[PDB]
Amino acid sequence: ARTTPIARYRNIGISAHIDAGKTTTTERILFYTGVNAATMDWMEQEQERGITITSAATTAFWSGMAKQYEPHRINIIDTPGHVDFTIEVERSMRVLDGAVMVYCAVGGVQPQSETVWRQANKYKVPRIAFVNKMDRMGANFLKVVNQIKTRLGANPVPLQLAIGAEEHFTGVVDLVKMKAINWNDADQGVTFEYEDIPADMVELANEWHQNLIESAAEASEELMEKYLGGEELTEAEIKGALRQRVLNNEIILVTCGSAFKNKGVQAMLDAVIDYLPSPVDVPAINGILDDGKDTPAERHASDDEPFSALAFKIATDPFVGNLTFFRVYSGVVNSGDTVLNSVKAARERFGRIVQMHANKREEIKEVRAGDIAAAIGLKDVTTGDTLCDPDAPIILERMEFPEPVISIAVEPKTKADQEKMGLALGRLAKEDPSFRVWTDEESNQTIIAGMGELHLDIIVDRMKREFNVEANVGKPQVAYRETIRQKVTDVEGKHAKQSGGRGQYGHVVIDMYPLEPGSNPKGYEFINDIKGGVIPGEYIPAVDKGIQEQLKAGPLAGYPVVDMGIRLHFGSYHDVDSSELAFKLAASIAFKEGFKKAKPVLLEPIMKVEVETPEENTGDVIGDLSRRRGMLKGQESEVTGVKIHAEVPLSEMFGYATQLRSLTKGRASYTMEFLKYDEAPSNVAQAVIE
Amino acid sequence: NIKSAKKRAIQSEKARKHNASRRSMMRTFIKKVYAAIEAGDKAAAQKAFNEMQPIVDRQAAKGLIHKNKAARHKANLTAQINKLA
Amino acid sequence: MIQEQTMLNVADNSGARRVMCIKVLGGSHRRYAGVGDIIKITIKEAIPRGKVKKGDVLKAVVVRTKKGVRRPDGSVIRFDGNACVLLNNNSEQPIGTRIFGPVTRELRSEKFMKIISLAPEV
Amino acid sequence: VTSYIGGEGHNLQEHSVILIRGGRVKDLPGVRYHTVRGALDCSGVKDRKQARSKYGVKRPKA
RNA sequence: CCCGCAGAAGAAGCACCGGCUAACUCCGUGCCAGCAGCCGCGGUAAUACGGAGGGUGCAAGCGUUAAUCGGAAUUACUGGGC
RNA sequence: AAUUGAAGAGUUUGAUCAUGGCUCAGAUUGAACGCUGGCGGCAGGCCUAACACAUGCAAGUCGAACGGUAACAGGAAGAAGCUUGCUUCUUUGCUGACGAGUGGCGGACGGGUGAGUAAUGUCUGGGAAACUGCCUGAUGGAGGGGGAUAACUACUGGAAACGGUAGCUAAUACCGCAUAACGUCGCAAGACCAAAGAGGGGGACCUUCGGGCCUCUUGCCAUCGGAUGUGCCCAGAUGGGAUUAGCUAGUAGGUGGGGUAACGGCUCACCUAGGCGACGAUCCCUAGCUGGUCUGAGAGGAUGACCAGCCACACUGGAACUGAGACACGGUCCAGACUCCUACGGGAGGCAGCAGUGGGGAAUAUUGCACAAUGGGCGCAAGCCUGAUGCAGCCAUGCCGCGUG
Numbered sequence A: 001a002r003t004t005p006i007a008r009y010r011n012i013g014i015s016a017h018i019d020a021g022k023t024t025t026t027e028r029i030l031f032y033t034g035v036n037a038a039t040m041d042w043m044e045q046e047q048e049r050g051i052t053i054t055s056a057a058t059t060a061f062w063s064g065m066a067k068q069y070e071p072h073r074i075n076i077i078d079t080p081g082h083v084d085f086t087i088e089v090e091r092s093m094r095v096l097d098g099a100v101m102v103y104c105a106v107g108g109v110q111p112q113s114e115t116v117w118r119q120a121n122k123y124k125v126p127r128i129a130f131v132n133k134m135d136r137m138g139a140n141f142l143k144v145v146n147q148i149k150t151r152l153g154a155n156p157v158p159l160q161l162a163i164g165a166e167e168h169f170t171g172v173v174d175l176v177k178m179k180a181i182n183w184n185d186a187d188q189g190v191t192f193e194y195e196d197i198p199a200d201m202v203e204l205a206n207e208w209h210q211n212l213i214e215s216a217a218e219a220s221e222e223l224m225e226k227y228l229g230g231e232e233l234t235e236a237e238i239k240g241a242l243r244q245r246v247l248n249n250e251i252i253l254v255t256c257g258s259a260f261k262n263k264g265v266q267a268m269l270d271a272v273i274d275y276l277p278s279p280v281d282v283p284a285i286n287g288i289l290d291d292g293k294d295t296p297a298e299r300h301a302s303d304d305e306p307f308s309a310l311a312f313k314i315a316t317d318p319f320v321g322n323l324t325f326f327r328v329y330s331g332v333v334n335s336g337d338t339v340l341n342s343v344k345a346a347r348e349r350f351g352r353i354v355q356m357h358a359n360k361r362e363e364i365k366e367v368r369a370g371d372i373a374a375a376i377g378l379k380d381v382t383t384g385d386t387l388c389d390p391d392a393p394i395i396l397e398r399m400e401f402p403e404p405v406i407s408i409a410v411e412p413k414t415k416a417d418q419e420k421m422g423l424a425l426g427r428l429a430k431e432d433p434s435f436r437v438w439t440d441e442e443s444n445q446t447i448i449a450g451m452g453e454l455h456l457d458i459i460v461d462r463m464k465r466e467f468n469v470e471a472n473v474g475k476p477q478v479a480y481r482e483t484i485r486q487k488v489t490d491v492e493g494k495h496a497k498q499s500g501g502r503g504q505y506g507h508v509v510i511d512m513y514p515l516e517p518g519s520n521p522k523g524y525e526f527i528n529d530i531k532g533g534v535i536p537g538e539y540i541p542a543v544d545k546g547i548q549e550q551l552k553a554g555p556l557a558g559y560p561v562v563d564m565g566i567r568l569h570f571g572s573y574h575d576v577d578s579s580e581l582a583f584k585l586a587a588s589i590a591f592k593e594g595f596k597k598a599k600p601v602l603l604e605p606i607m608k609v610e611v612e613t614p615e616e617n618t619g620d621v622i623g624d625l626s627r628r629r630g631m632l633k634g635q636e637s638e639v640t641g642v643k644i645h646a647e648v649p650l651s652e653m654f655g656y657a658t659q660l661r662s663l664t665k666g667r668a669s670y671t672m673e674f675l676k677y678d679e680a681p682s683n684v685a686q687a688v689i690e
Numbered sequence B: 001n002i003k004s005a006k007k008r009a010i011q012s013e014k015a016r017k018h019n020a021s022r023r024s025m026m027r028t029f030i031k032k033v034y035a036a037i038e039a040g041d042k043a044a045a046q047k048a049f050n051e052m053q054p055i056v057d058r059q060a061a062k063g064l065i066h067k068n069k070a071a072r073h074k075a076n077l078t079a080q081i082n083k084l085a
Numbered sequence C: 001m002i003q004e005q006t007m008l009n010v011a012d013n014s015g016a017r018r019v020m021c022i023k024v025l026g027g028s029h030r031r032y033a034g035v036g037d038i039i040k041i042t043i044k045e046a047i048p049r050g051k052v053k054k055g056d057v058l059k060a061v062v063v064r065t066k067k068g069v070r071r072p073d074g075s076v077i078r079f080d081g082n083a084c085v086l087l088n089n090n091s092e093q094p095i096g097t098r099i100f101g102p103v104t105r106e107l108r109s110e111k112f113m114k115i116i117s118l119a120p121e122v
Numbered sequence D: 001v002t003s004y005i006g007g008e009g010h011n012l013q014e015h016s017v018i019l020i021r022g023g024r025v026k027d028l029p030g031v032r033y034h035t036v037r038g039a040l041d042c043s044g045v046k047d048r049k050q051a052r053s054k055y056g057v058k059r060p061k062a
Numbered sequence E: 001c002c003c004g005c006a007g008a009a010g011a012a013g014c015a016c017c018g019g020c021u022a023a024c025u026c027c028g029u030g031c032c033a034g035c036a037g038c039c040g041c042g043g044u045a046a047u048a049c050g051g052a053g054g055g056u057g058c059a060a061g062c063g064u065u066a067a068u069c070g071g072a073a074u075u076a077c078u079g080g081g082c
Numbered sequence F: 001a002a003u004u005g006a007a008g009a010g011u012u013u014g015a016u017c018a019u020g021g022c023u024c025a026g027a028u029u030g031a032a033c034g035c036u037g038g039c040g041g042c043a044g045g046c047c048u049a050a051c052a053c054a055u056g057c058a059a060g061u062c063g064a065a066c067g068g069u070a071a072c073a074g075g076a077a078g079a080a081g082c083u084u085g086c087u088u089c090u091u092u093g094c095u096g097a098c099g100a101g102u103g104g105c106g107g108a109c110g111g112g113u114g115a116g117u118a119a120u121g122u123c124u125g126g127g128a129a130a131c132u133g134c135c136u137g138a139u140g141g142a143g144g145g146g147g148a149u150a151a152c153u154a155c156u157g158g159a160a161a162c163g164g165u166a167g168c169u170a171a172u173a174c175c176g177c178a179u180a181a182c183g184u185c186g187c188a189a190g191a192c193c194a195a196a197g198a199g200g201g202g203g204a205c206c207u208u209c210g211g212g213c214c215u216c217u218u219g220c221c222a223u224c225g226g227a228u229g230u231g232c233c234c235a236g237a238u239g240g241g242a243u244u245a246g247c248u249a250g251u252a253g254g255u256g257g258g259g260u261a262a263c264g265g266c267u268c269a270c271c272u273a274g275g276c277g278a279c280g281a282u283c284c285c286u287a288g289c290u291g292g293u294c295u296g297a298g299a300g301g302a303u304g305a306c307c308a309g310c311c312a313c314a315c316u317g318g319a320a321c322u323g324a325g326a327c328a329c330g331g332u333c334c335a336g337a338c339u340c341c342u343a344c345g346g347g348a349g350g351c352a353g354c355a356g357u358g359g360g361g362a363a364u365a366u367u368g369c370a371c372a373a374u375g376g377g378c379g380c381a382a383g384c385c386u387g388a389u390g391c392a393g394c395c396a397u398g399c400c401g402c403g404u405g
C-alpha cells in the first residue's frame, strides 16, 4: 500500500561477553521507548539458567529522550554472549546494519568480546559502544575504553564521560553538547534538566579527546582546515563529522552508563540515531545471478527496486507453525507475493506476516526494504537462503556457518525413543546450522556435534522439553585395525576332504609379511610367485579370495586387517578333486596359524592435529598435546597466534575443545582429520577387548 | 457463552419459576379430589372437582398443561367421583 | 506422622492412586514426616495411562495427614486420610498438573506454590 | 520387515529414514518390498542416465 | 468477449525395445555389478545388467506403488466338480 | 429414439493332453511417490487421530411492544469567541436515531462429523390413537380492573468473573373479574376456559388540548378447516460367527389405576405363566442406511467421498428446564478427564461451523473478497445479520479443451 516513515530505520544488534547486561540493557530500552517490559530472555531454559540462548528481535519507536528528534524506528536484536551459540551472532550481524557493543565497567574486554569483535569486522558492520555497569565496584570507564584500543586494535573515541564511578555514579557528560546530563530519582529515566559539567571534571571535560573534535576533523580536510584555523566547529557539523566516520568504521564512539540505576541507557539510544546507519547509509548488497555468473546483485536500498531478502533464523511456534525471520534488503513483499528461494530452486508463497513488536506479535500485510520480520508458514526455507524477486533472481552472501568443535555420541535411553531421537535431532539441525548430526559409518552409533560442551548440553535438554526424548550420552567409539609385525616364513594350509561326496582337496604354502602404508586403495598385497605349475592358475584366484575373506575382521578382536602382503610359493592338487572351494578353505586355514605366529598387533587411528593459539600459552597447549599421548611436528609462529602441529591419537582427543579453551582463556581454534594407523600401547590394546 | 442471546437463559428461568409455581398448585388441587375419593366423601369429591375444573382449564389455555391433559383429568375424575359417590 | 511403610493417597493426577513411603528424608534417624514434609516413595497402585507407573521410586509432598496440623493459637486441622503430591526426583516440583481435595496454609512455600494455586481450599 | 535396495550403490545405514514401496524380489524369499530410491533419506543412484524416474535421479542440467 | 502491438518469439518431458508385447545395435561388464509383473537374464563376442546410438509408446504428463472389478466358468443361480 | 452386448495370453514337461494355482493385457481412484511440468474451463481436495487446540469470524433482529436517554446527528422550553444566518459551547428526548434493560420473534433453521447404532436406524409397502410456530379459509370475539419488576437511584463487596442490600417504574411482561360456543368434561341436565394493543393521516364537534373522535394498516383471543412439519404402529428386506444353544421378572398376556400430544409394561398393584429360539434367539466381531458410485455382456462382485433423502452425534457420562418444536453444535445443571486466567481468596473454556496451528500420516488447501445474486432470521419498510451462498487463493488430484509454431 503506502508505507510511512522509511529510511529512519535503525537495524542494530546488541552483543558482548557474558554478564555485561546485553539484555538487561535491552529491556531498559523497551521501557524508555515504550513510554505512556516483555523480558528478552523468554525461553523457559533461558530463564531457568538466566542466560540468553537465542537471539531475540523486537522493534520500538524512539523520538529521542529530549523530544529532540523526528520519531525513528529501531529494530533491536539481543544476541547471546557465550560461545557455543556464536551462530546466533553471525546471523545477528550479517543481516542488520548497526551494532552496540556492550562492555562491563568491571570486566575489561574479556575473550568473547574479541570474538564478537571479529564477527563485526567479518561483516564490516559499523558500531558504537556502551560501557555498562558503571555502578559496580571496580568500575572504571576510561580503563575499558583503553582496552578497546589495546586489545581489540581499534580506534575508540569517548563520546562521553562518567560522573564518578561505582556506588558514586550519579550521571554522565555529553561532551558534544558539553553538558552533564542528569537523570532523576523516580520515573527511572525520562526527565533531565541537562546540568552543566561539574567543577570536578572541567579539566578532563576540556578534552573531548580534543581528538574527538580532531577526530571529527579528520572526516575531510576542508572540515579541519577551519579547525587548524582555530574555528570552533558547529555542533551540527561534528555529529555529521564523526558519524561519517562511524559509518566508515574508523572510529568507535563510547557512551557508558548503568542499566540498573537507569543512569545512562537513554543517552545511548540517541547516539544510535546520531551515529549508527540508516539502511541507506549502507553498501548495497553483493551477490550473484543464478547459473550464469557474478555481477554484484547490487539492489539499491530502495522501495522501488526488485525484492531481495536473506533468511536468518528459523523457529517453530506451537500455534502459528514455522517462523522464518528475514531482512529485506531491496524491493518489497506483499502478503500473497510468491517470492523465490534462489538457493534451493523452488518458489515460496508468502502468507501471514508478523513483526515482533516490543511485546505483541503484530500482524502485517506488507513488508518494505530495510525492515525485518518473520514469515509464517513458509515451507522449506533454511537459514542462509535468499528470497528474491522471481523475475530478478539473485543469490546473496549468506554469512558463514561456525563449524562444530565438539562431538559426543548419544543413545536414546529408551530403545523405543530411538525413532524419535532421529526426528528431533533432525529438527534441531535445520534450526541451528552450527549443530550437526550423523551416524558413524563404522560402529553405527548416533553422533551429534556442536560448538561446545554447553551447546551440546542445552540441545539434548531441548529434546526432553520439546520432543520428550531423554537419552544419555557417551564417548564415541573408535575404529581399530589389525596387522602383523614379522614376516612369517612358509606357513602351510591343507584341506583333504575324503568324507562322502565331492572329493575336494587343496594344499597351499605361503609367506605372510607386514607392509608399510602403501598404495591408497589396497593396504593389501597378494603375489602370484607360484612355481611353474604346482597349482593351476585357475585356482589361484580362489586362494586370494580365501585370504580376502579373513581380512574383514581379523583374529585379535574383530576389526579389519590392514597392511598385509601374501606370496604363493608351493602347494599340490588332485587331477580332479581340487576346486575353487578347496583352496579357498586351504588359504583360510593357511591365514590362521600364520597370523598366530606372525606377532599380531592392535592398530589405533591418529589425527593430523592443528592447534592455533596465542603466544601466552603455547607452553600449556604443547604439554597437553604431549599428555594426550601426542607427537609434535612444527610451530610456524603464524602472525599473531602460533600454529602448533601434531600427530595425536583419536581415542584421546575426545572433548579437546572443552579443555583447549580452559588452557587458552577461550581463545584457541583447532582442527583435525585422519592421518594414519599406528600401534596402540599395550594397556590400550589389551583394554580394547570385545 | 459470549453469545448475548444468553439472555434467553435468564429469560426462560423466570419462565421455569413461573410455570413451576402455577403447575404446582393445579397438581395439589387435582390431588384434593383424589383424596376425597379415597376418603369416600361423595360431596367433597364433587365439591373439590368443581373447585379444580377452572384451574385445569385456565392453565391449559395459558398453555402450561395443554388441552387434552385438561380433558383427561376432569374426564376420569368424573368417571370415578360418580362410580361409588 | 507418616514414617517408613505407610500408604498414602495421592492428591494430584500423574496417576498414582496408592503409594508407599520408603523413607522420611531430611535427617539422620528422622522418625516422622507430616504437615508438608518430603518423603521418598514407591508407587504401589498406578492408573494405566498416567505419568507414573507402578514400581517407580520418586519423592512426594505430604499434603494431608490424619494427625493433621496445629499452628498458632492452639487450633487443629485434621484430615480423614493421608495424601501427598508426587514430586519429580531431581527438581522436587509436582509431576502432576491438578490438585484434589483441600490443602493447608502451611504449604505456602516457594516450591509448593503451584500446589496452592491449584487445589480448591485452605 | 526386510526390504530391497535397488540400483548400483546406496548410502543407507542404521538410522536412515526411508520410504518402502512394495514389490517382491523373487531371489530373496521373505523380501516383499522395495525401498524407493530418492525418497526421504535415500539418495538416487549416482551417475545413472536411463529410467531415472525409478532410482530417483534428476535430469542432468540441460 | 472483441480490437490493436512486437516477434517463433516465453512453453517437452516420461516409460519401454528377450518372450508375454509395439520397438535392435555397439561398448563396458564377466554368476561380478545388477535386472526381474510371470518364465527368466549375468561365469569374455549379453538385442535381458550399465552407458551410447537408434527405435517404440504415451505426452503436460509419464511411470512405480496401493486399491476394487474384469479376464477367473478359480464358490460355477445364470455357469463346475468328487 | 431410449439398460441391442460376452476375445484371450505366459507359466509345471524331453514332448503331450488334462487338471490347477500363480501371472499379464482393460476399466476405475478423494490417491501417493519418482522424474517432468505452459495456459484455460468445469470439478475435486484430512480416507489416518470422533487427537488436542492459540487467534478472528460462523446469530441475530425489531424504537411501528415498553420505560428510556450512554453516544451520534438534527433541531434549540436559546447561548459566544463575534467568522450576523455561515460556525462550536450549555441545555431540552423535542425529532431523527440509538448503548444498556424489560418485551417479542429467531437461537430446534443453516452448517459439521460417522463416534454410536446389524436394527432403538435405513429401505419398500401399508396403518391409527396424535400434536403442529410463522403462512392460509371461515365465524365471532376484542369488555372492565389489579399486583409487580428489570432498567434507574442510593449505599456497598471483587483482581476478575460476578454481584449484594434498600427504594422507584413502563408495556403487547404478569394475574384476577367479566364475557363463554359450532370449545372442553358430561347420556343429558348442566358446569367450566381467553385476549393487546400499535402505528400513518384527518374534516367537523372538541378536551384536562395528552388527545377524545373518524378513518385506513397491522397486531391480540377463541373454535373449525387447509398447508407444511413431527411423533407413534405393522410386514418384508437390509453384515459375518455354532470354535456362540439355549434366552427371558415388567419378562409374555390380562384386569384396574396412573401417565403422554397420542396408542402401548409407558408406569404401578393384583391375577394368569407365559414370551423368544435351529426360519439362528442369546452372546461375540465388524458397520451409519438409501438414491446412487465402480466394474461386469448379464447375473453378479466391490463400494456409500463429493450431490440429494433419512438417521445419529456435538470434550466424556448424565439430567432436565424454556418452548409449537430440544432433552438443544457455538443454552442451563451435575459429574469426569483436560487446558487456561488470578492480586491466591477465586474464575473460565470445548472447531466433528469457516480459516488456521500442533500431532498423527504415504497423503489432502487461504488465519481471502462480498452480501451484488439465490436463499434463511428479525423488521410495515428502509434495513441489520448471514464463514448458508456467491466468488477468489492453493494443489496436474481428475475430466475436457488449446499451445509449445
Ligand SMILES: Nc1nc2c(ncn2[C@@H]2O[C@H](COP(=O)(O)OP(=O)(O)CP(=O)(O)O)[C@@H](O)[C@H]2O)c(=O)[nH]1
Binding pocket: A016, A017, A018, A019, A020, A021, A022, A023, A024, A025, A050, A051, A052, A053, A079, A080, A081, A082, A132, A133, A134, A135, A136, A257, A258, A259, A260, A261
Ligand atoms: N549492578 C549492576 N548490574 C547490572 C547492570 N546491568 C546489568 N546488570 C546485571 O548483569 C546481570 C546479567 O544481566 P544480563 O542482561 O542477563 O547480561 P546478559 O548479557 O543478558 C548475559 P548473556 O551473555 O547470557 O546474554 C544481571 O544480573 C543484571 O542485573 C548494571 O548496570 N549494574
Ligand SMILES: [Mg+2]
Binding pocket: A050
Ligand atoms: Mg551466570
Ligand SMILES: [Mg+2]
Binding pocket: A021, A022, A023, A024, A041, A051, A052, A078, A079, A080, A081
Ligand atoms: Mg542476555
Ligand SMILES: [Mg+2]
Binding pocket: A019, A107
Ligand atoms: Mg566477571
Ligand SMILES: [Mg+2]
Binding pocket: none
Ligand atoms: Mg518384440
Ligand SMILES: [Mg+2]
Binding pocket: E045
Ligand atoms: Mg561382450
Ligand SMILES: [Mg+2]
Binding pocket: none
Ligand atoms: Mg539395457
Ligand SMILES: [Mg+2]
Binding pocket: none
Ligand atoms: Mg465371476
Ligand SMILES: [Mg+2]
Binding pocket: E080, E081
Ligand atoms: Mg471344478
Ligand SMILES: [Mg+2]
Binding pocket: none
Ligand atoms: Mg436497544
Ligand SMILES: [Mg+2]
Binding pocket: none
Ligand atoms: Mg373467567
Ligand SMILES: [Mg+2]
Binding pocket: F256
Ligand atoms: Mg390400565
Ligand SMILES: [Mg+2]
Binding pocket: none
Ligand atoms: Mg386408565
Ligand SMILES: [Mg+2]
Binding pocket: none
Ligand atoms: Mg462406526
Ligand SMILES: [Mg+2]
Binding pocket: F300
Ligand atoms: Mg460371479
Ligand SMILES: [Mg+2]
Binding pocket: F316
Ligand atoms: Mg456429551
